[model samples]
Target: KLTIWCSEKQVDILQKLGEEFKAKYGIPVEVQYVDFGSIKSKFLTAAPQGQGADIIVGAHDWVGELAVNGLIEPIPNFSDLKNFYDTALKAFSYGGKLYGVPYAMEAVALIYNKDYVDSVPKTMDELIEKAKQIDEEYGGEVRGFIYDVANFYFSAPFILGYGGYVFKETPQGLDVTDIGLANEGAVKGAKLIKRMIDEGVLTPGDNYGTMDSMFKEGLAAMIINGLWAIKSYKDAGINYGVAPIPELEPGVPAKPFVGVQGFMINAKSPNKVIAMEFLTNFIARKETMYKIYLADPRLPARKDVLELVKDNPDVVAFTQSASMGTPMPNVPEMAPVWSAMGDALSIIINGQASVEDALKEAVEKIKAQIEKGSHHHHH
Candidate 1:
């Protein structure tokens, strides 16, 4: 018998896959659905007590903590990885070893109202110009593009488009000593946010809820959001289209963070052999990927499955955006970056501090936290 733990969102398809696998191999299988937020902590606590599932589904970023704690095992057969996207696979890798089999990938994209705009803007300058025109023609009823500037995840495309990165990757793994969030390009990116606010294109104090509400109410012309927002827009009866976020300049593309969700095996599982066989043979199959795609409809990690769903407008837009994405650094050191960067962006966007001062402070705080955490780990 084999046991698997997955989130409620993926339970249906995974349950079907489990049935198929058991039928073929004559081995009983058990599928447990847990909430996404609790799965990681629960698995970490349970695995060492000999109570964890044989296989668990989670985000690629979890690899850092799980791998370091010796809670998960590396994928035994690297050749079985050929079907997955390179970037998705890379997200589950640490220290040059693959740790998970990715099933889906997500990234933010520019979703615009087709009824309000005739064509998509190719650059931030053009987008601002178009927004200015729309606001004037609409009597300031409908603003331009809106996104959560205070969020590290949402703001990363702008920061990275200007050449900012979280950690420097090397042959020895992520060099935590090298922090670049406050670099020259990051300052420029922050300045871009200020420019947009000054130009009356983006509103101050914007957030995910505000952006989604405005876009759905037809009070905003465009928004930078994820695939999860598509259903809401559809429910609101908005005629919308998805496109890659505009570049900061003419040639530079906005590089959003690519996040992958996948399955990892427990290192201490007595059923490790069965888990490997199920993952490599059943879960990795195109048929299995397609079934999951049909149930959830997110962009699949398999190129073959993506081709099958290429006609989906959401898939087309997200895949295009993800093509230029930088995988979120999966190293454990990355855990401190979100709060630190989020604080800085909030202060900068809220007029509490200068861009340079805020980012520098944020970077310093991140370094201190990482160093402090490292010392604790050693102890």
Candidate 2:
């Protein structure tokens, strides 16, 4: 028998799919949907007591917390690295070893309403210029572009587009001692936000809900967001199209943080071998992956599945955006960065502090938190 834990969105498909696995092996497959927000927390406590599922469906970032504590097993015999998206593979890996099998990939991109804007601009500067023109034509009632300016996840494309990073990757892994958030690229990126504010294209109190609401209502032409919101946009009957967020310059792509979700094996599960077999044989096929993509509507992790879905323009566009994305760091040290950058970006966007000062302050706070919270490093 195999016990699996997944989110509500995946429960129906997994249960339906597991019947196929059961027919072959005569083993009962128990599929349960767990709250996505608490999957990691419950697993942290439940697994050591032999209460966790054999396989858990979760995001790749969970590897940092789970693998670092020896709670999860690494998939040493997984397929060749070139078979999947590089960003997905990299996110599932912890310290150069694979711990999960990524089935879906998600990254932020330019989500635009086809009514107000038809094609994406060649550069971010061009988009800003276009936004200004739209803003003027509509008397600021229906702006061309607006996003969660202060939120780190939404702002990450700009940070990377300008060639800055939260942490540096060395031979060992991510070097927490070397943060590049306050560097020249980041400062330049922050200046662009300031430029948006000064040029009257952006406001001071922008956030996710406000940005999302406007786009859904057709008040805004475009937003930089992920696939999670695509369903809502579709339900709104809005002719929305996804595209790559234009580059900061001619050659540099806007690299948003790519998040991956798939299955992971519990190290202590009695069904470990069976779980591995089920994943590799029953779950990883192109048909199964495509079904999963149809269920979730994220970019497929495998190249073959991507080829199969080429007819979907939205999928193709998101795939183009994901191709240029940076893997969201799955290491535990990445914990502190979210809060620090969150604070830094909000301050920078509101013009409360200079971009250099805000980012540097956040960087130092990240260092201090990492040093103080040594428990974040190990069990």
Candidate 3:
């Protein structure tokens, strides 16, 4: 018998796959539905005690922590990786080892209301200018654009476009010694937000809920969000168009973080051979990939599955935006960077301190936390 743990959102597809695998092998398959948040910690605790699933479906970002903890097996046997996007495959690899089989890709983009804007802005300056015009036209009723300015995920695109990076990448893996959050590029990136606030193009209360409600209520012209917002906007009957985030300048693009989710085998599993076969022979097929995409219309990782959805406008826009995205760093060192950057962003966005001072403090704190083993956990 082989058992797999899948998140609530993906359990249905895994159960269906389990049925097919069982019919061919005549081996009983158990599909356990696990909550996304609890699965990692639970697996880390249970696997060594001989109570974990043979296969676990999770995000590619979990590779660094999982591999370092010796909880996951490197997937060197799956050699058909040439059929998936290079970036997606890269996200599943850590320390020169492939740890997961990627299925879907996700990244954020610029979403605009076609009713309020004639066309997509090509650059940040153009977007600000157009947003100014829209604000004036609506007489305080509609804002030009909004996003969670205090969140690192949403702010990374602008920061990265200005040349800021979390860690230096090398052939070995992420170079934890080289942190760039407090560098010159990050300071310049911080100033971009100040510029918008000074121009009245952005203001306080542009957090997630406010921005989401305003956009859905037809009071905002544009928003920076992920693909998860597509269904909501469509259900609201809003005429919106998805586009790559406008460039920082004529040639420099805003590069958001790309995240991939996939299946991985537990190193502690007794049924390693059967689990690997189930993934490589069953779930990794183009037909299976297409079925998963149909169940949840995320951008597929398989090249053939992508071809089938090439004509979808949302898929095309997301694929284009993801082309410029940087894979979210999966290194364990990344754990402290998020909270550190979030704090700095909050201070800067709330006008509590200078951008340079805020970022410098953030880097110092991140280094301190990392040195103190603050990031050590069964993530």
Candidate 4:
């Protein structure tokens, strides 16, 4: 009696969840895999026509775009709120109302090929040393630490660990005028990326594809990525270990952006009432929660489910990294923030601009876009 649009990576677990839900509610639960990139826009289009699924499994960031447009429902407050990670809960909340039930939390952490590092390095410098060793040991055929250096989402930890932030978050939402991309700490963050380059640890154009394929092929020793890559590494027959992103210095942690994945009901779904039941009564239970964990094994959003997987080292490592995370801003205005920051990082990556020039310019670009958004509201 329910339909769910899910990610390919998550299709199996969703099937399990759907199976159990069918047993309990005595209604059929159908699951579909939608192109993740297209899910949002397609949903936005189909939902208005009543062709949308009863539920959609998606990232919390989509709340801004969907909720603001009346495409999704604001869930009635759940009494089990205390069981979920606060960041996960807040990630799906827009204008102080929750639009979804968060199932998993994720953030980028240090992932190392077991053949290269026996254990995670205690500090960033040591991690660099290990990466450099891989390069020298491999005779430059295999490399060291490489990641999507230009993507704002992946590079965010560098700036976020320092004093940089996208906006000043308030109960009402993000205060966009207070952009922190060009702060002193962010300046320091950018320099560290440059430092790795100078040390020959990070190649000039190393990006996600390079980082992903090489790490899978055992041609790279380490990477900075999230849970989504777990299956790929397993499929490649590479032994990997998850660990907190090594500390920036003695005490400072690398603050990656935390994302919460959840189930959102289509605002226009005629089955909304039963969909709500499927959420709180079934999906919210610990049994379903652990099943979700086993299916994809992303860090569970439920505190109780986390306890069930407490012995799993991979989950533990990401938990440690996520402990230092800042929830990604979920505002419609956040749309342009990505492209603007991406342009700045690309500029620095290509050596077309210095950190200060790139960040300062990008900061202005972000604010101008936010300003335009605000003016659209006013004028």
State candidate 4's TM-score: 0.89
Task: Write model 4 residue lDDT over 25-121, tens digit each, in one string.
Answer: 7888899999776888788778888899999988887788787778889899777777888778888998889999999999999898888789889
Model 3 residue 72 distance off true place after TM-score fit, in angstroms: 2.6
Give one digit per residue, the lDDT tens place, for model 3 in 1-379.
Answer: 9998887667787788788888998878889988776787788888988899999987777788778878888887566677888778888988778898999998899999988999999899999999999999989898798888888888888888788888888887677788888888888888898788778888855788798888999888989987766767888988999999999889888888888988899998999988888888878889999998877677899989989988999999988898898888888677677789989988887789999999999989888987887646543
Give candidates' CA RMSD values in order: 3.5, 3.3, 3.4, 2.9
| Model 4 regions lying over 4 Å from their true place | 23-26, 49-51, 78-82, 170-173, 374-379
Structural RMSD, model 4: 2.9
Lowest-scoring 10 consecutive residues by lDDT in candidate 3?
A: 370-379
Q: Across residues 65-134, which tens digit of lDDT does each residue of candidate 2 receive?
A: 7887778888866554357777677788877688988898888899988888878888988999988888
Worst 10 residues of 1 by lDDT: 370-379
Model 2 root mean square deviation, Cα atoms = 3.3
Cα deviation at 231, candidate 2, in Å, is 4.0
**lDDT score for residue 184 of model 2:** 92
Worst 10 contiguous positions by lDDT, candidate 2: 370-379
- Against the reference, the lDDT scores of all candidates come to 0.85, 0.83, 0.85, 0.85
